[PDB]
Amino acid sequence: AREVITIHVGELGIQIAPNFWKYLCDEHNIDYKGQEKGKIRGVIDNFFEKASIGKWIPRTILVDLGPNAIRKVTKKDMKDFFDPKRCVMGLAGDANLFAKGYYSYGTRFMEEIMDKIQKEVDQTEHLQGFIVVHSIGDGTGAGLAPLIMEAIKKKHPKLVMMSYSIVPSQNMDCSTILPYNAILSLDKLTSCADISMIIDNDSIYRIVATQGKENELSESIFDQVLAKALVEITATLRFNSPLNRSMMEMSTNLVPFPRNHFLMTSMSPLETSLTSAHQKIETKELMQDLIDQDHILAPITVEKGVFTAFVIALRGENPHSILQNSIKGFGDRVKFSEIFPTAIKADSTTLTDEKLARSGITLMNHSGVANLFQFLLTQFELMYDHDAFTTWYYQEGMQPSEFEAAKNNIQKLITEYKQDEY
Amino acid sequence: AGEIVCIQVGQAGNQIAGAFWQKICAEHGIDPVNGKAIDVVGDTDIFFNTIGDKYIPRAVVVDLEPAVVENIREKFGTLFDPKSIVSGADGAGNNFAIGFNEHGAETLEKVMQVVEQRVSETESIGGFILTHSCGGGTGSGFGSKILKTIRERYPKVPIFTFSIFPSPKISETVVEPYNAIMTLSNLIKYASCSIVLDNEALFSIAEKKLEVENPSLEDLNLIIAQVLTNVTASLRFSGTLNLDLGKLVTNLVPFSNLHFLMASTAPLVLAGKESYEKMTAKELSAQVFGDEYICAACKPTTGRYLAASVLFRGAVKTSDVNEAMATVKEQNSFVNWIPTGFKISKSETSPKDSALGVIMLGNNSEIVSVFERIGANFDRLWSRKAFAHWFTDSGFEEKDLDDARALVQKVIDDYRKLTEDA
Numbered sequence A: 001a002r003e004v005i006t007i008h009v010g011e012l013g014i015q016i017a018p019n020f021w022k023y024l025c026d027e028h029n030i031d032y033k034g035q036e037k038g039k040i041r042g043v044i045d046n047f048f049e050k051a052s053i054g055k056w057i058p059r060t061i062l063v064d065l066g067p068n069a070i071r072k073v074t075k076k077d078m079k080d081f082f083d084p085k086r087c088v089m090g091l092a093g094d095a096n097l098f099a100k101g102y103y104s105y106g107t108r109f110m111e112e113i114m115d116k117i118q119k120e121v122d123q124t125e126h127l128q129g130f131i132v133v134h135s136i137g138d139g140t141g142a143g144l145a146p147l148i149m150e151a152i153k154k155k156h157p158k159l160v161m162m163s164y165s166i167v168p169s170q171n172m173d174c175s176t177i178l179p180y181n182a183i184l185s186l187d188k189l190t191s192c193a194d195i196s197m198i199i200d201n202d203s204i205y206r207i208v209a210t211q212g213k214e215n216e217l218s219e220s221i222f223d224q225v226l227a228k229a230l231v232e233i234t235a236t237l238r239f240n241s242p243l244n245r246s247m248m249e250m251s252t253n254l255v256p257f258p259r260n261h262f263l264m265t266s267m268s269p270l271e272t273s274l275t276s277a278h279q280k281i282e283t284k285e286l287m288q289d290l291i292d293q294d295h296i297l298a299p300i301t302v303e304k305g306v307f308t309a310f311v312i313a314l315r316g317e318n319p320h321s322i323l324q325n326s327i328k329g330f331g332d333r334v335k336f337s338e339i340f341p342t343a344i345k346a347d348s349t350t351l352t353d354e355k356l357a358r359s360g361i362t363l364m365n366h367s368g369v370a371n372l373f374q375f376l377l378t379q380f381e382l383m384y385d386h387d388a389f390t391t392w393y394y395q396e397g398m399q400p401s402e403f404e405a406a407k408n409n410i411q412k413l414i415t416e417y418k419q420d421e422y
Numbered sequence B: 001a002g003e004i005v006c007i008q009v010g011q012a013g014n015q016i017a018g019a020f021w022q023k024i025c026a027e028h029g030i031d032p033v034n035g036k037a038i039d040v041v042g043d044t045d046i047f048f049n050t051i052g053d054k055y056i057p058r059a060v061v062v063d064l065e066p067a068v069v070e071n072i073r074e075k076f077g078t079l080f081d082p083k084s085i086v087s088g089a090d091g092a093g094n095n096f097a098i099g100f101n102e103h104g105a106e107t108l109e110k111v112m113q114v115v116e117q118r119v120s121e122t123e124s125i126g127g128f129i130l131t132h133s134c135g136g137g138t139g140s141g142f143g144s145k146i147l148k149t150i151r152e153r154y155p156k157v158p159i160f161t162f163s164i165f166p167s168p169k170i171s172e173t174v175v176e177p178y179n180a181i182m183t184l185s186n187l188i189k190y191a192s193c194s195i196v197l198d199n200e201a202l203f204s205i206a207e208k209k210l211e212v213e214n215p216s217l218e219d220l221n222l223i224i225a226q227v228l229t230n231v232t233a234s235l236r237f238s239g240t241l242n243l244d245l246g247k248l249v250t251n252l253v254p255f256s257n258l259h260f261l262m263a264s265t266a267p268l269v270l271a272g273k274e275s276y277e278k279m280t281a282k283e284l285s286a287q288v289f290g291d292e293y294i295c296a297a298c299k300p301t302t303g304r305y306l307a308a309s310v311l312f313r314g315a316v317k318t319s320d321v322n323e324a325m326a327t328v329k330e331q332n333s334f335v336n337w338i339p340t341g342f343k344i345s346k347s348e349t350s351p352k353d354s355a356l357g358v359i360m361l362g363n364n365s366e367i368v369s370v371f372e373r374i375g376a377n378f379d380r381l382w383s384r385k386a387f388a389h390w391f392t393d394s395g396f397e398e399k400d401l402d403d404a405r406a407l408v409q410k411v412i413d414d415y416r417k418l419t420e421d422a
């Protein structure tokens, strides 16, 4: 078994954790507290550690500078699972600042964090990699996630590191300094992640609002969508998949030009409030949903821009004759840049989910990520040029040359992605 | 963690705060007569300590006059435990300089010993809140030295003040323009944020919205208490935006030295069950952002906002909130440097007197109208050395009050210039 350690950092990493881990538990027949039920199915070792007798342990670390995300997760949302021995808890907020988790406060925990990580590493014969789940734009996550990631890679350089970067939406709990924290942290992800997936909560919001369900939106719907995305993305690493049997393969399939590792994803079905009743999806429709605009959890349209890589990972019964004919319907939409002579890869793994006949996700390496970046960069520059809110970072140690450097690396990254279109 | 210590200084401070403490006790299911739990709800621990089944408000009660603090035992009684009650000598008053320099070395030390005790009992300080008069004697004099001292001892702990600016409609003690600037200067130098309330606005609100023919000091306090209660509420009762004091500074203060905030709340109720039916989001947002409910003598619709924060307390639909707030954005100008900065949040817990209440805070360039009037009153008296030697023998030199004015003028000038365009 090639195993993965999962680290949850900051508010979204930790608020997601209970949904993510509950879903995995059901997928493998783990009865929520680690108790085995029925028969274990899937490669359970990849995400759960063995108790001496029976019980399974999520292979996780929960890191939060403020005590609240962790306290409700371990006392109210999922008991006797996220063992306190593996929680790193601070006693102060970040005041939403990047700086706090990277330079002035979160740094005092790095001894503790790296010690706990090694303790997880030491229990496994074959690491495949690390996955760090975090909010981008929220100081604790924006700060610690790249601090942690960098510390790991200089110690375990041969492992693939993947991050799940969640961009806060404006109808949820965002800070007024979101644009600052966002590019200050993209700047570090660009130098430490091997694979980084960006999921935009504003698209989750837009899709649900489009459905006529905006008045039902709450943290729980966002957490369910985000958790399902993690489960499906990670799903091919939990079974005997034909597409991505390892994070090492994902790196090869998804990022052929190492700096451009930021990915966009899509899913179908989406289940707002879990009341969607997707009683039947035909194979042909599943692929059309995955390409269609309203299932992309990012502000991009597949009809614009270019692809560098595109992997369609389906679940359940998806005959290949249909998949191959269906893909031709993408002829006027899915265009790859002629710097990389690739093709759309598509195949499927099994479901242990009894409610959906079939489902699936896509991973896209697509130039449209540049538009998410440019939006944030424009906001950054507009605020930065008038020093709005910059004093708060300077007093924590962020010498202003740091802001200029972040601006330059993201403008350069944006330029490089758009260049693939010319 | 994220706990708040509250310091009440002077008469105005103790009466306003006393009213605050009674309202907050009601909301959290605490019987204010003795601190006993009724059915406790919300994040009680942010403002109350707990011993046994008694909730103890983490207040420091300060005056110079023996009687003012001693008589709290009759007005509020058991609500404020005696260990927090500090006063001394024979009292002092009606002169900033006296409160600031003649309070007694022992008097200030006792205040600080109590502050430290409240702090050591607390898991992690999220900030300090002070309630005080900006004029008179004790509230401005001793209160400003207290403000100064606290920041020196706790350099990174944000301090919020609720402060009351004087009005000639109420007080004949026209030495006040001197007191008003000396304390404003210290607020500029040491507070992280401050809520500018004044009695000219509160008085006219009482006359026109509470329908009081001749507002009493107690009606002014009623309105103030409602503002403090509902403003503070964003920190303590759930909510969709996950705020703390450090976070409020980050969201509402784009520049240091420009941290003076306006506050507005509605509906207002004249101390009885006058409330009726239910207000819609539209009429309620309109009141809050109108000039008529601003609790500072400003006319904010004519200015420009750097930032704003609007809390809806009660059962309001997301779609009505968003339509109502879209109307506000169209009608009241914002500085475009901040592409964000207007944060809307809601909390499911309504205030005790209504189905839905709305609270707004913000940075509006017209806030300086208060400061400009104070300056004018000061200039008429100051250019004539109205009261040089009084202040000369209490330890202040002309250069110090000139420094105070220079700083105040700098803030005024920066607000006018900063928001001139965008």
Ligand SMILES: Nc1nc2c(ncn2[C@@H]2O[C@H](COP(=O)(O)OP(=O)(O)OP(=O)(O)O)[C@@H](O)[C@H]2O)c(=O)[nH]1
Residues within 6 Å of the ligand: B009, B010, B011, B012, B013, B015, B016, B092, B093, B094, B095, B133, B134, B135, B136, B137, B138, B139, B140, B164, B165, B166, B167, B170, B171, B198, B199, B202, B217, B218, B220, B221, B224
């Ligand atoms: N809005 C409001 N203003 C008040 C209240 N009490 C006093 N003030 C005003 O604040 C100023 C009085 O300052 P005080 O704080 O009373 O003076 P002090 O600090 O008690 O010490 P002395 O100056 O000795 O009384 C005057 O403008 C009062 O009208 C109040 O309850 N509400």
